[PDB]
Symmetry: C4
């Protein structure tokens, strides 16, 4: 029987069936969006949900006993378990968030489907080349998120009144979203020297933000 | 068969079509003026039908000359569409179609070869990218849903529907007013809204960035492979 | 003839001009100060005319020394233009030419070699793009019209004119307030307005993407 | 004794120990932000700082004589020295600004740690290729900041009423933040041709700022 389950899991029909449950449940999860729906067919789908998660457990379990240790060294299956375990967390009570994170089980179409897996892994293999820069940037923010707070948090509490609020406000300034009209120009009505903080921050941040990309294109071309 | 062809294949023919386009092209940008469309309003409302009726004739003549080859040529199909588009009667129907006639000024992109190359050069990029647009389309969809069932209750205008979440997420992707316009107000009710939109902005920007780093490497691989 | 030529082509000539350039360059940024233009207002409107007075000789020296080479040289044609601009009388006429005088600080791009190349290095890039500036320009034109006759009725400042559409389309291209400022209000009247502006933004940027990759290549 | 002290500095324990205080002072700098803290163990921490900076000074002192003039031809140590010397400047009176500039000594976590230096020096090695264009950019701005002042400072003082404020507003337009809705559209209600000024500026400047990236990608690919 050891092998009876093996031929099930590795069969193309098995993969076909999982993907079918995905694309179907993918649709129907976006239908519990409609209020009209969750009245006419509302009872219908919370159960169909309970159905699909039940099958995936079997499938994810079938994958377990068939692959033994092969299952738990492959990110896609570890993700499958979590993204199933998430939806395995009870519907009732608990926290409302887990009632929502079930939708992550539609990234299982990135698992169950091979062509996406490559696009994904192609992008992630690129990540490590950046980590030397991402770290500095985080320190850089940290050294700046701190200064902003004790420079501007006094009269501008919402934006800089907290290291957390400064980190948010600094990220937004990095994104350049309303940084001047919304944040800096108001700031200067009180501290006319604010442009010495945020202009250098912006230049440094954008400059460094660029090199990261060339650092990527340089890697592949070299 | 050959009597019409030498007319059709003449350099004068290609020269002649382009003339009608820019003619209608200019004049379509002249039917814009209110001053214009009364004194010469009647004058010009005809010239359109003139240009397209000839275009129809042009579109009519061109078919039999190339036979099935006409409907295997992408460039001609748009001429056909935007001639067919412009052929549809003015009255009733939908107001939208009086405007899609103006697409027949992208028919100035068809008859000219120099345009054909630039365009397909841009489009030849699509298939290598298509794998990523798909992943992105999924990514949005999995998030447009969550926003709807997280924020649409108290923020209907932005997230009250999968459609409005899809919009609001696209706008956040473009980074236009994501924080001051959407997240900061969102955080006034869900002080944890930034845990949704900050990662999305990163992931989405992450992906968008790689798409170009996948293209520029694709081309600096032609010149690092011919170099052998 | 060569007596002036050996003067004109001398490095001291180049050095002295650049000195005059940087000099008048500074002084233009002081006609900005209100404090300045009263106490030292007389001082500088003349020094302006002074520096502009010298520049005529230099361009004339450059002319006869370079003969026709001067009027086939963009740098000399440009230098000449920005002197001719500054040659227009200070009083009356149009105030713009008293202001366009400041363009004579791009004459620091001529007399200085490193600038000449950086500028020309940037411009040699242009011809490969003109194929796209054209198609985009057409792309705008075919859309700016449609914007006018769809939204210009109820939204006049933004789309009420082919001209106002071009401006509003440039802004949407840059993505500045494109959604909050333009589309979301537009949608209050035409709930399908997003089918216009998303492809425009997509196509426009996708094109603006390719222009850059084409440059690194 | 000359060499007796020298072997201390390069010891595995020595380098490790400074980085220790850096992250320590690095951490502790981010707690003087919270008001809750500055009472129970706030006093605890006002003291802990003076310890760290005193050691940081000593550390910087040892490095000098051991390296002799070699300390003052090395940018990395001079920053440590400066960013510690900064922290040596008296607390009382003066300007509040210096209570904030202490935190830059957590960029001493970029010095005291070797692995960052390369990524950093890679970014700085990029700078010279831009200076040819960075200058022209600066040239371009100045010629325009003047025009804006003497075109728009009349009715729009906040934005262009001074060469300095025009320079500010021009950078803001360069970043494209609210350039149309925030500045140009209001400008056009009084100067309906203002768009002939800012569209080319935006075009050329963007024309240029992108060339900077080529100038980066080209030069760094050599
Ligand atoms: O992390 C701290 C903050 C949240 O702290 P918190 O005070 O809890 O925020 C609540 C919401 N807020 C800001 C409105 C009060 O979290 C934020 O919201 C700030 C987001 C972190 C900014 C990004 C930090 C790492 C990326 C730095 C750049 C590296 C890539 C180039
Ligand atoms: C799906 C929705 C349905 O449209 P709809 O519900 O009518 O949204 C209209 C917005 N409203 C109600 C405020 C007028 O349609 C939309 O929401 C349109 C929003 C644009 C969709 C763009 C999403 C594409 C992301 C994938 C990108 C792939 C490559 C990056
Ligand atoms: C707890 C929590 O995080 O959720 C916060 C809120 C619910 O709390 P709250 O904002 O207080 O709700 C308002 C209370 N009311 C209606 C009576 C006024 O509910 C929310 O607003 C949720 C916001 C958190 C979303 C973060 C999701 C990140 C997903 C990315 C992780 C993917 C891993 C695979
Ligand atoms: C980056 C890809 C390269 C090619 C893309 C560029 C395509 C053509 C440039 C697009 C930029 C044009 C935007 C623009 O400045 O339009 C203004 C003029 C007419 O302005 P105007 O006469 O003042 O009419 C009122 C419009 N207003 C007050 C809002 C400015 O509009 C015109 O007259 C058309 C000028 C063209
Ligand atoms: C590249 C050039 C980037 C320009 C950087 C910049 O922000 O220029 C601003 C400065 C400040 O002049 P200032 O008028 O003193 O600003 C204070 C007035 N306030 C508070 C209302 C802004 O205006 C200046 O004059 C300094 C600009 C020289 C930087 C050139 C590099």
């Amino acid at each position: 029987m050891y092998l009876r389950i093996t031929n099930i899991v590795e069969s193309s029909f098995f993969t076909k069936f999982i993907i079918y449950l995905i694309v179907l449940n993918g649709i129907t999860m976006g239908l519990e969006t409609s209020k009209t729906f969750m009245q006419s067919f509302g009872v219908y789908t919370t159960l169909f949900n309970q159905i699909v998660i039940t099958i995936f457990t079997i499938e994810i379990i079938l994958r377990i006993y068939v692959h033994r240790i092969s299952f738990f060294k492959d990110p896609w299956s570890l993700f499958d378990f979590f993204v199933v375990a998430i939806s395995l967390v009870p519907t009732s009570s608990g926290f409302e968030i887990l009632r929502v994170l079930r939708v992550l089980r539609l990234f299982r179409l990135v698992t169950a489907v091979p062509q996406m897996r490559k696009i994904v892994s192609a992008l992630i293999s690129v990540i490590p080349g950046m980590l030397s820069v991402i770290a500095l940037m985080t320190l850089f923010f940290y050294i700046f998120a701190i200064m902003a707070t004790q420079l501007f948090g006094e009269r501008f509490p919402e934006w800089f009144g907290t290291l957390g609020e400064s980190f948010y406000t600094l990220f937004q300034v990095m994104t350049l979203e309303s940084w001047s009209m919304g944040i800096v120009r108001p700031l200067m009505e009180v501290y006319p020297y604010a442009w010495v903080f945020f202009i250098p921050f912006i230049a440094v941040v954008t400059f460094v933000m660029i090199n990261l990309v060339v650092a990527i294109c340089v890697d592949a071309m070299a």
